[PDB]
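Section: Multi-chain targets

For targets with more than one molecule, the full set of components is provided together so that the structure can be written out for the assembly as a whole rather than chain by chain. Components appear in the order listed by the source. The example entry contains five components.
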Amino acid sequence: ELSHALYQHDAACRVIARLTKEVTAAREALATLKPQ
Amino acid sequence: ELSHALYQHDAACRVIARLTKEVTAAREALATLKP
Amino acid sequence: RCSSLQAPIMLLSGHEGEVYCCKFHPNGSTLASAGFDRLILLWNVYGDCDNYATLKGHSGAVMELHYNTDGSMLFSASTDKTVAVWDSETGERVKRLKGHTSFVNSCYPARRGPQLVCTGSDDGTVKLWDIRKKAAIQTFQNTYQVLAVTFNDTSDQIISGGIDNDIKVWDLRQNKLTYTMRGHADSVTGLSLSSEGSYLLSNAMDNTVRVWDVRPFAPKERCVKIFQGNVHNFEKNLLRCSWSPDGSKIAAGSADRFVYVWDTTSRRILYKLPGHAGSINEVAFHPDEPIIISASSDKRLYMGEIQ
Amino acid sequence: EELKKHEDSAIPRRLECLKEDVQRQQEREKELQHRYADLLLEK
Amino acid sequence: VDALPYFDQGYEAPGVREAAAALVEEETRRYRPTKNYLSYLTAPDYSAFETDIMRNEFERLAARQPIAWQECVNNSMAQLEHQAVRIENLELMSQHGCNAWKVYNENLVHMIEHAQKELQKLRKHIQDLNWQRKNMQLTAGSKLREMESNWVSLVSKNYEIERTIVQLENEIYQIKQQHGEANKENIRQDF
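Its structure, encoded as tokens over all components, is:
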């Protein structure tokens, strides 16, 4: 359960980090395209 | 090591929950920001 | 190689002439087919102890056949030059409509059901029809014979195609059409529209399936995808292309005597189903169960199922 | 076993999110359909 | 709550390494009691309840601490009798043979073969599970990609009606005042 919690923790924070980076990229795209 | 694994599991679950909520909030803001 | 195994299938006999078209009821319980024998075919189908029965009254060979959204009524276009309105579950038909100068090319119901049905005749007639009023809707003429005419999902638009070698978009309620959308080429193997309404899949007599995404609202005039790999018609034939919305699929006939299954969104088709003794005139897909109706010149309907 | 357990159990969350994005896509597409339809009919 | 290690290939080991243990180190720095782990390892412990007795305590103290008329004929006669018994045991052992080193070696080889077979079976099962998880991750990944593309196209469709609606209000005023009945209605035209 320690190794599974470490792999699931690195994959959880990794997928959440990729979702935050892609969500920030889409938020910057659509946010910058609104006034234009 | 099991205690440190439980601390990293609960804390990693809190960071994953906050980061997931922030990613969902930024995704919803990016979806509703176009109109 | 292409197709996956064999799987069981149901062969429907009793057709005297070559089957012109095949369709199923919205409930999936019965399936009607039209052919050169001038007799509509009612089928208990979705599983077989039997088909349903035989329907008569057509003065000529039925060119096209379709069922209303309710399922109790159906419309058919025949060489008799009269729009065929048929009630079925009551034991007898609906009504016979007239006014066509030439043989009716195709007849399809609209989103309003019996209220209005878009039809066309080989004279070049593109006309909506009111039924329950004991008279049609309106008549129109654009360019040439329209091979297939069907109303959109919103009933406000009617798409048609034919020997005019163009994609026919028609506005109706404005007493005038919509627009003519075509590339550079001349072929018509048929015309069809997707269930989503954002695109239309037309069959090209060059043996080229042309899927065009344009859709209402913002101006597009764009396309969808180009489906190929199967020859629908060798020289001149009428093929009814029915896509399968289950997952993503597009069903169509072929002149190679094999049912044409095409996957689209994968940038490649689906599979080719052999076992037909003649060129497939039309194919259908049941929404409830993954079954396909196969109507070919062999006068034998082959309904396949995926398990 | 636990990875496939939680993964397969939480997959309907991602699938439901896809269905929600498709629902919002149909809502925006319909709103644009009526908006540009009335704008085209207003000419 | 669904994160596959194979879902996002760009970040796995370096993906969450520093920052993840930094937030976990922030929560653990805030508070770090013990509940589930200490309560789980508390009942079995290691050796606690039973503790045995006697040679358990004496052997524990030995673990923490790494440290005459008859007597001639006694140890002497015992050395003679022990030498005779050892001569008899060596006479039997040398009189028969061994064969038990080779037999037991073959038995150990068989046991090692069985262990290798079990390890192979476990590796096969783990491989199958990883394959199924890979397929599910592929399907969910494709569905997620189609969902994001559909969301981007949906935002573009709403933005297309936005800008064309603003130009429809400006052009609605242009045609309005040039034709367009009067300027009242068409100037208020909006999405």
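Chain E touches chain B through 24 residues (CB under 8 Å).
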